[model samples]
Target: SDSKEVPSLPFLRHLLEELDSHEDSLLLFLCHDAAPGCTTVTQALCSLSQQRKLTLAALVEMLYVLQRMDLLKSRFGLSKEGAEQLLGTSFLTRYRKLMVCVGEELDSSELRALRLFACNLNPSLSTALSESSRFVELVLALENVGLVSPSSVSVLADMLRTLRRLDLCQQLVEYEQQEQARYRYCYAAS
Candidate 1:
């Protein structure tokens, strides 16, 4: 809980400017609740950082999770080993965890196919998917456009089945079922 040095105001400001490059995902993820009300990424993080919920370390944690290795090094001077050495245990929220899980579990080729699926559909998804990277990246893009979310994970399964990856699709269904079951029980208990 003792950060040797906090990032300076200029560095922080520059970093927020640089953050626009990641506005689609990282900025959205980072500022999702900052404003609960952010009209823009810069404004959101700018105002929130001033309030200072003991960030620096938390921001580092986010870059690590988001796999912004370049930003981590260029801005924060932390590599994998450097980041690992700093942020202890964990600081990720469920959305971050969910993105990782959904993003990683699917193989690259399957994700490539999913991209093709989007390309073929071309009407709604194409705008959101102007750029491409990992499956999680795709999920973030789709999530931005309302095609994906934890509750509507079935959209993925539906698309998966369309791609004839019932193997993967069923898994999504099962996970969704369990998620619902847990929600049901939690609600019932509460």
Candidate 2:
């Protein structure tokens, strides 16, 4: 009875309201920012080089783009630099613990999926349960609505294996290198 021959704006609004349901009011903000330098620089170079042209016009455009990128960062709380630091630290501090959690949650049948993942690699990291434990936990977490899975048993195994391969100095060096790179980009660390 409520169905109309021609749907109207109100009908569309009602449809959207019904679809979003519990979370209609929540806002979703989007970000659009340019990369650090002028895109035109590439074009200029292409024009200049017979082998590969490089020109002044492209260089100017690139500089403008970089300028705009800096302005955007200043406007948006400088998220790029902050994000780089966070990315560099997250793996160093919690990677092993995260792996153990993953290993604990996977079940016997589900683990076979990981073997397929391991078979395609350079050093063959996937061949061993040691590297795959974290992977198991990730899939198990996705599938397990409740708490039980094959991963629940393997989590402990991951922890033991990780402990055996413990090299705090190596991890620290990696973390420092990441941090150093972040600073080098700005000439701040030197």
Candidate 3:
């Protein structure tokens, strides 16, 4: 426990493989906006385990969040409730949670709406060719082109409003406030 904190690399690869086929948006969530070099599930898992300290405990928490109880038990031998009682607080970053939360809430129709609104948001973000692009794809591209983000999502909020998803826009408001509070805290301490 004192040396390396990485989990079983092969086992984790298998875990992500199942998710890669089903809930791949989580994969996109991991690699969204490049995520400092996260291009694939294995890459994201390895790098995050070593760099972000993504322990097995956190993986269980994520399983709980996604309600993948089948994998939780088959892989970790833990119930979802048990996973909840173990964590005192969120293990993942706030921005990470925001991206996941928002991405899941949006479905196929909203995806088309986002495509329709893309050129309005940013001309370079035209999705004319990428018909099957997922919500995470749109968001990552937007972030890459400098349109939306956790700290500055006013454009995204308004776009979500256009889709009649006030809930998501409100969610962005909270994320924006959290980032504001965080930056203020860091700034005030200096």
Best by lDDT: 3
Q: For candidate 1, give the lDDT of residue 141.
A: 66
TM-score ranking, best first: 3, 1, 2
lDDT, candidate 3, 1-190, per-residue tens: 5322335777876787667543665654643333466656666666666665666665665666566888888887777666676452434656765666677888888877887678665677774427577676677778878777666789889889989889998988987887889678978878
Per-residue error (Å), model 1, residue 89 = 7.3
Winning candidate number (TM-score)? 3
The Cα local distance difference test for each model comes to: 0.64, 0.31, 0.68
Per-residue lDDT over 52-114 for candidate 1, one digit per residue giving the tens place of the 0 to 100 score: 642677667656766678998887677788887655333345445555645555676777888
Give each model's clash number: 0, 25, 0
Ranking by lDDT: 3, 1, 2
Candidate 2: tens digits of C-alpha lDDT, residues 27-137: 000000111222332222222333221222222222222233353244334344432332222112122333332333444544544445434322333334343343433
Q: Point out where model 1 deviates above 4 Å.
A: 4-6, 23-25, 85-92, 97-152, 161-190
Please say which candidate is ahead in TM-score: 2 or 3. Answer: 3
